[PDB]
Design a protein around this ligand. Structure first.
Ligand SMILES: O=C(O)c1ccc(-c2nn(C(=O)c3c(Cl)cccc3C(F)(F)F)c3ccc(Cl)cc23)c(CNc2ccccc2)c1
Lengths: 260, 258
């Protein structure tokens, strides 16, 4: 069934390109200077970026504005991921509650995984690659906002040293979604059955796409440990931001859209 | 590596695991499932039978200090095992220490699962058996100390690993190049690369019907990392509430800065 695993890999890659506008291939071409993006490195260039990079989220404090900007984009990504999951063979046949449970607990790990595609050591692409926020500008943010963003850079630097491309990541993402260990799942067996195929598919993909990179399969799986740990730490930052930043108050309809 | 070389590394590690850990999973299962009239444990399920166990083999504190002493013993055995992992003792000293500092706990809960079923845990080299319910009913935060380890053990034991498997898995845990503060990640990763290859072949040969067991076993490393985190936070809570309590220097040092 080797031919079958190559086929599943091809299916997921095609769906991945369609579901996610800014591919890792495209983002790397932009970061490496290969139509140049707008750069945000201080407060003034941010003010000129809102009226130039036309962020879809301007509705008075700067660090809050950035954090909520990250929140809005993440809510957009949850919809893109939801559309991608539907293409995973077997996903839409699962019990409806279980699909909702797999997406509820998986989007956070997928977002961080995919955010690494947009980062280098020096910053992160934004607005489908038209803007660029420097690591230094993010690390220097006041309050606990400065420490929210630096962990994602540290993880992305380690993670990106694996040198995965989009065809690799498309299967990795599918594998995260089909985690049979999410709390409250009603029928674990078909989820773990699908994950086995995706796991076979990822293993073959990495041997063929990285024949020199020994044990790349194992090493990528160990990155799920790091992902789970950073999602957990991130949650505890939200609780602190909710309970300390009353300036982080929103319009009730807005609070409601962004509560997840 | 060549298959014959990986089999040789697997055999070396199994051999050293038998030498370093006196109570193997094989022995613990023979005691837990029994039929054996020579290996039968005394069962501790309440306060009185605990008192009768003292004459055969605050209450919640005594138990906690019991786990602490056994934990130090486990660290000693794990440290003796690590020394046998080819390449380990040639590494920079600080990294040897760093690998053990972050590795021993994940290995302790791994091997603790061998001593557990759904109903309790072997103790005192298999001569006793403390029920899960009795531990869950301990007062203050102590009742919540041991139950996460049970939840992991039930799932982990469903993998049906034996000792030859665990020996290689334990080795892979120690040689993690992602531990905070490592100075020379490359030589650690080259060793883990060999150990990961050895584990792959071993699980394929010993569990050929167990699809993707290699992948499933590695994902269990996620669950280990989370239970270590919870344990540490409980220790900080007990430290600030029981000032009469005290820790072993080996344990003291493992918990400083995660
Ligand atoms: O394109 C994406 O998929 C994408 C996804 C996440 C982020 C981003 N999210 N984020 C969070 O805190 C966060 C995460 Cl990880 C997960 C869930 C909720 C949150 C929440 F709610 F808190 F925001 C960051 C913290 C630090 C950094 Cl450097 C980036 C992030 C970004 C960065 N911005 C962006 C804006 C426009 C266009 C492209 C990019 C992009």
């Amino acid at each position: 069934e080797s031919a079958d695993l190559r086929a599943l890999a091809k299916h997921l890659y095609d769906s991945y390109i369609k579901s996610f506008p800014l591919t890792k291939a495209k983002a790397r071409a932009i970061l490496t200077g290969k139509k140049s993006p707008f750069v945000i490195y201080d407060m003034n260039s941010l003010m000129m970026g809102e009226d130039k990079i036309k962020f879809k989220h301007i509705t008075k404090e700067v660090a809050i504005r950035i954090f909520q900007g990250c929140q809005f984009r993440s809510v957009e990504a949850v919809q893109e991921i939801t559309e991608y999951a539907k293409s995973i063979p077997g996903f839409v046949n699962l019990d409806l509650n279980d699909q909702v449970t797999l997406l509820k607990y998986g989007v956070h790990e997928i977002i961080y995984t995919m955010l690494a595609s947009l980062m280098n050591k020096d910053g992160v692409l934004i607005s489908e690659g038209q803007g660029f926020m420097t690591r230094e500008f993010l690390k220097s943010l006041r309050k606990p906002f400065g420490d929210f963003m630096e962990p994602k850079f540290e993880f992305a630097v380690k993670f990106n040293a694996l040198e995965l491309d989009d065809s690799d990541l498309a299967i990795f993402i599918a594998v995260i979604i089909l985690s049979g260990d999410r709390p409250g799942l009603l029928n674990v067996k078909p989820i773990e059955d699908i994950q086995d195929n995706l796991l076979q598919a990822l293993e073959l993909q990495l041997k063929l796409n990285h024949p020199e990179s020994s044990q790349l399969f194992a090493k990528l799986l160990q990155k799920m440990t790091d992902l789970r740990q950073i999602v957990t730490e991130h949650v505890q930052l939200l609780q602190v931001i909710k309970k300390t930043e009353t300036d982080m108050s929103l319009h009730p309809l807005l609070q409601e859209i962004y509560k997840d």
